[PDB]
Amino acid sequence: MYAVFQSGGKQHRVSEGQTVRLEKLDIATGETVEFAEVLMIANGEEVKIGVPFVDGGVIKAEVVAHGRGEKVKIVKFRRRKHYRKQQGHRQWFTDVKITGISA
Amino acid sequence: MKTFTAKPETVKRDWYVVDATGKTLGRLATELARRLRGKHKAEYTPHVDTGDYIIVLNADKVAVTGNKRTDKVYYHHTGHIGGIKQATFEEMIARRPERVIEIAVKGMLPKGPLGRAMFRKLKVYAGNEHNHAAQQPQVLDI
Amino acid sequence: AVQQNKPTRSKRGMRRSHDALTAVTSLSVDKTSGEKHLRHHITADGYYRGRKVIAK
Amino acid sequence: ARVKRGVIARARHKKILKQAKGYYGARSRVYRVAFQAVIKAGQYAYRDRRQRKRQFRQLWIARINAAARQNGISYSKFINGLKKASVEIDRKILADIAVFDKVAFTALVEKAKAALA
Amino acid sequence: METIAKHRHARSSAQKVRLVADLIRGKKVSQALDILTYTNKKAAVLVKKVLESAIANAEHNDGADIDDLKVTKIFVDEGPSMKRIMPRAKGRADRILKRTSHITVVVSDR
RNA sequence: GAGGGGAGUGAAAAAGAACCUGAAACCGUGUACGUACAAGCAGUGGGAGCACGCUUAGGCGUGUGACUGCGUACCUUUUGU
RNA sequence: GCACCGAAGCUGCGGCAGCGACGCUUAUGCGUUGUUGGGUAGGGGAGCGUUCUGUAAGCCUGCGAAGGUGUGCUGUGAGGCA
C-alpha cells in the first residue's frame, strides 16, 4: 500500500517499511510519530481527500533521533569592492521507519 | 526522495508517420518539434531524448500562405567576400525541397549536442513513399 | 613576435605527438654473413649478400 | 622577539589546494590561481542553490502538463479545476504518482473535470 | 627479480632521451637491443650500454635465464643543469643551462 | 672511465661522501576512469553509465562525470570596468 | 473576459543572531512576546591563531616528540581533536 502526507514544511510520498527523512521533532529518541495529516491512502487503488486530510487514515512511524546534518560553506563575495565573508550551517534532522498506512 | 528521473536506457522512443500536404508551415514544424523532443509524452527529463522517431510524407506541397509565399527572406552564408546568398521559398521548393522543412524546424529546435541528437531522428521526404516501413511505423495526425 | 600567454603543458604535449623515432625492425640474417644486419648494406665483418667484401 | 611564519601559510594553502582538487590546469595546482577560482566557485555554489528550487518546480510542471493532456486537459485549466473543486492539496512533487499510477492521476483529472463541468 | 639498473648524469635533456627510450619500452630484449643499436641518436649509444649492463647485472646477481627477457619499465628523470653565461650583444647576458639526465632501467622476464 | 647492482659495514644505505629533515613550483612512470561533429574565465546545480570497499544493503560509501540548467578573472583606481 | 505562469518579495517548517517589553530570575541568563538582521568610506563591539616569557625541576614523550604527508571527525568562523 502507499500514502502521501504533510510533515513540517512539506509533503512526502510514503509506503510501509520505507525509511524517510524528517525535521527535528520533539518526539523521544526511538518513539513513534503519528500522521493524521494524510492526503490519500491507496491499497494499490486510491481513496483520496475531498477537502484536505482523509477521514480514517493514520500513519504510525518510529523515529531515529540523529542530530546535525552535513556542513555547507555559504560564501558572500563582491568583486572589485573589498568585501567577503564565509558562514557555515549543519541543520538538524531525524529519520523515520514507517509502520503506518492504517484506516 | 529526489525526482524519479527516467534513464537514457529505459525510455523507448517509438515512431510516428506525418503528412505535410495539407498543412501550414511553422505551425506544422511546432508539432514536429514537440514530438521530436518528447515534450508531449511523459518525458520528465531536462537532458535526454524520450521522443519519437518521426518521418515525413509529401514535404514539398506544404502551405506557407499569406503574401509571404512569394517573398520570405531565407538568408544563407558561404563564408566568403560575396558569401551572403539569398533564396526565397518558391526557389527552395523549385530545387532542393527537403532542406526547407529541415532548416525551418532546426531553428525552432533547441540547443547543441542533445538537439543534434534530436535532429538526426527527423527524416524529410518530398516523395510519396518511404523505406523506413521496416520499423512498421504508426501513423499520426494532430 | 612573442607569445601573449604561457601556452599550456597540454598544448605542448599535443605538439610533440610526431616526435618519437621509428623502430628500425627489419634487420635480417644471411647464410655466410653470420650477422643480423640492415638491408642493402655490408655487415661489420664484410658480408654483402653472401659475398665477402673488404677481401679478395 | 622575532617570528618565522611559513607553517600556518602552507597549511592554509593545503586547505585551499584540497578544495581545488578536480579542476583543470593551474586551477588544480597553482596557489594564486586556485585562491581565485575556489572563491568564485563558492559564489556560484551559493547562487545556484536558489536555482535548484526553480528547476525542480518546472520539471514537475512538465510531467503534469503532459499527463494532463492525455486525459485531455491543459495545465492551467487543470490546476484551476483542482482548486475550484475542494481546494485539493495534491502537489507538484506528489504528482510523481502520475508517473507511477495513471488511474490514480485519472481520479485527480476526474474531479478536475468535476470542477470545470 | 627485475634487479634495478640505472645511470646518473648523462648529457641529455630527458626529452631527446624519451625518443629512444619509448621504443625500448615493453619490448623483448633481443628485439629492443637491435633497435637501440641502429637508432642513430647520441642518447641511443648511452642507453645501449645501460640496457646491456642491466641484462648482465640481472644475469650475474639474481641468476641467469636471459633468453626470453623483456625490458618492462624504463624511464628518465632530469639531472642538474650546468650554469654558464653566454656573451651576447651590447653586454646582454644569457642563462645557458646545460641539462643532464638520469636513465633508469627495470630488466625483467615479466 | 663515468655511473649502477650484488656482496660488506652500521640501529638506519630511501644515512654513500654532490650525504639530517626533504614541502612546493617542476618533469615522468604505473594504474582507474574520461576524451577524435563539437565552441567560450574552464565552474557550479542536476545527472545516466562505468570502475572500485561492499553495507539488511539492493541504487550504502568512494573515484570518474557521457550529457545537461545557470555561469563575461582577480586586483587597483574610479561617476562608471 | 477568465485562468495560469512568474523573484532570493510575501506566507509555510526548522535553526541561528541584535535590541526593547513581560515573566521565570530576582546581577547573570534563560523562558515568552514584539520587532529587526543588503552595505563601500567609516565608527563601535565581540573573537581566533601564531612566536616568545611565566606558571613548569609541573605535565606528556624514543612502546616513537616536533616537523612532513594522508585519512576520518568536529565549531558559526578564523579553526580544533582523534
Side-chain angles (χ1 to χ4, degrees):
Chain A
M1 310 194 191
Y2 74 97
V4 275
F5 72 97
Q6 169 61 58
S7 194
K10 64 281 311 311
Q11 312 80 358
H12 303 125
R13 180 187 176 210
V14 68
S15 191
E16 185 183 59
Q18 198 172 9
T19 302
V20 296
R21 195 144 293 174
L22 299 182
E23 300 61 50
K24 188 182 59 58
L25 312 178
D26 294 291
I27 305 298
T29 53
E31 188 47 59
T32 310
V33 190
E34 185 173 297
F35 299 101
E37 312 90 283
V38 58
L39 322 177
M40 177 267 255
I41 54 176
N43 57 69
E45 183 181 293
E46 68 306 316
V47 178
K48 60 181 288 295
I49 49 163
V51 297
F53 318 114
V54 183
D55 297 71
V58 66
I59 311 178
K60 302 294 281 182
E62 313 304 289
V63 76
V64 181
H66 175 251
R68 320 185 68 211
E70 290 56 46
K71 190 188 291 292
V72 289
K73 274 290 186 77
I74 303 93
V75 175
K76 299 293 173 62
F77 171 56
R78 206 71 63 76
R79 70 109 162 292
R80 303 186 293 99
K81 276 185 167 182
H82 193 229
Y83 164 90
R84 184 163 60 253
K85 62 172 71 185
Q86 298 188 16
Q87 188 221 290
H89 183 57
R90 296 283 306 214
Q91 214 209 87
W92 292 76
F93 70 80
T94 62
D95 293 303
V96 291
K97 188 178 300 300
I98 309 298
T99 71
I101 321 176
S102 295
Chain B
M1 179 59 76
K2 70 194 198 69
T3 52
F4 290 95
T5 315
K7 304 183 179 187
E9 185 53 57
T10 53
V11 297
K12 302 177 184 177
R13 291 73 172 193
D14 310 301
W15 299 80
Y16 295 130
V17 189
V18 179
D19 166 49
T21 306
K23 304 297 179 61
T24 48
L25 202 52
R27 292 176 178 258
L28 171 58
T30 302
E31 166 70 304
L32 295 172
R34 59 189 291 255
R35 305 308 177 129
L36 198 72
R37 197 172 191 168
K39 203 184 192 197
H40 77 288
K41 288 182 158 59
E43 175 229 71
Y44 202 41
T45 174
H47 83 274
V48 78
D49 190 2
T50 61
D52 307 71
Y53 294 79
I54 304 96
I55 59 176
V56 177
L57 211 66
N58 315 301
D60 71 292
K61 305 98 173 61
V62 71
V64 69
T65 199
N67 198 43
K68 57 174 143 77
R69 178 65 192 202
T70 54
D71 285 286
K72 197 168 177 188
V73 301
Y74 299 96
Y75 298 119
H76 193 285
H77 196 253
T78 67
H80 308 90
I81 67 294
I84 184 62
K85 293 178 188 175
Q86 62 188 122
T88 195
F89 198 83
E90 302 288 14
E91 305 180 303
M92 302 180 76
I93 293 296
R95 49 194 286 237
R96 205 183 77 166
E98 293 178 353
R99 288 286 185 277
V100 178
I101 311 305
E102 293 197 65
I103 59 93
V105 75
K106 181 268 151 205
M108 206 191 304
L109 285 164
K111 74 185 82 282
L114 180 63
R116 293 188 291 257
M118 294 298 183
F119 197 69
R120 180 175 168 221
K121 299 186 301 190
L122 181 64
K123 284 294 198 76
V124 183
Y125 291 77
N128 313 116
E129 62 295 304
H130 58 100
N131 296 286
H132 307 326
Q135 300 298 293
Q136 317 303 291
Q138 210 294 115
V139 67
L140 181 63
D141 200 1
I142 311 184
Chain C
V2 274
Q3 68 181 235
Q4 179 55 22
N5 297 91
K6 189 182 170 68
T8 61
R9 49 273 106 180
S10 195
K11 253 70 169 178
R12 179 181 71 198
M14 289 189 170
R15 188 166 67 248
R16 293 180 177 167
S17 67
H18 304 93
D19 290 6
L21 296 161
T22 303
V24 186
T25 307
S26 306
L27 306 169
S28 65
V29 288
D30 199 17
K31 78 290 284 176
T32 41
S33 73
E35 292 188 63
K36 193 190 300 182
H37 66 300
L38 183 59
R39 202 171 186 77
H40 313 120
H41 287 78
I42 202 170
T43 77
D45 196 65
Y47 273 93
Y48 187 50
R49 301 173 62 104
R51 306 176 182 171
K52 194 179 184 181
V53 185
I54 318 300
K56 297 197 301 183
Chain D
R2 206 171 70 133
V3 67
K4 63 194 175 90
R5 309 174 63 207
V7 182
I8 61 170
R10 295 197 299 238
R12 189 180 67 160
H13 302 169
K14 292 170 72 73
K15 194 189 181 192
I16 294 295
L17 266 293
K18 194 173 300 298
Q19 294 171 92
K21 288 286 185 178
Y23 271 66
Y24 173 69
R27 298 175 176 68
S28 59
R29 295 175 175 89
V30 177
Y31 180 67
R32 282 192 292 102
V33 180
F35 192 75
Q36 293 181 209
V38 74
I39 266 57
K40 193 57 162 283
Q43 192 186 69
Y44 295 0
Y46 172 67
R47 171 194 65 186
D48 297 348
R49 185 158 55 245
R50 298 300 187 256
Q51 301 198 106
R52 184 201 293 158
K53 286 60 162 169
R54 297 182 189 179
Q55 289 171 92
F56 276 61
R57 186 182 244 236
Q58 291 175 273
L59 186 62
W60 294 331
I61 285 171
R63 58 147 159 62
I64 291 165
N65 200 354
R69 291 178 193 243
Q70 295 178 251
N71 289 351
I73 189 64
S74 308
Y75 168 100
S76 51
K77 295 92 181 171
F78 174 61
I79 294 303
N80 184 20
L82 301 176
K83 305 296 185 179
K84 290 193 174 182
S86 307
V87 205
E88 308 178 299
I89 60 173
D90 197 295
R91 231 206 78 218
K92 304 188 185 61
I93 202 169
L94 303 185
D96 281 305
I97 294 168
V99 182
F100 280 80
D101 196 281
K102 300 187 178 68
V103 188
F105 175 83
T106 304
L108 311 178
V109 178
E110 175 183 61
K111 277 76 182 182
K113 289 186 177 180
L116 294 165
Chain E
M1 208 63 184
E2 299 77 64
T3 315
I4 196 62
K6 326 167 180 165
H7 172 50
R8 304 187 71 168
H9 305 277
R11 284 191 173 224
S12 191
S13 60
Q15 180 178 350
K16 293 180 293 195
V17 182
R18 290 160 188 190
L19 277 58
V20 182
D22 290 349
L23 292 176
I24 305 305
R25 196 193 300 199
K27 291 289 193 298
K28 58 169 65 178
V29 296
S30 185
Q31 179 67 242
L33 196 60
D34 293 311
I35 289 167
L36 191 43
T37 301
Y38 291 102
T39 302
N40 302 75
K41 316 298 264 176
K42 177 179 280 166
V45 297
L46 300 174
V47 173
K48 185 178 179 294
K49 295 188 72 179
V50 183
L51 177 62
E52 193 177 303
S53 196
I55 294 164
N57 198 73
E59 190 285 298
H60 189 202
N61 295 336
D62 197 52
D65 200 10
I66 57 177
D67 305 75
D68 68 302
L69 272 47
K70 300 167 192 176
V71 43
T72 298
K73 313 187 75 173
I74 192 170
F75 48 66
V76 60
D77 302 274
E78 55 275 275
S81 295
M82 317 306 189
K83 305 199 173 184
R84 308 288 172 246
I85 299 177
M86 196 66 204
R88 271 209 303 135
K90 307 186 178 179
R92 291 187 173 200
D94 308 310
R95 301 176 290 184
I96 194 165
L97 307 178
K98 305 177 65 59
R99 305 187 169 278
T100 63
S101 293
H102 275 48
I103 294 78
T104 295
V105 194
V106 186
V107 49
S108 43
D109 82 302
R110 295 160 290 108

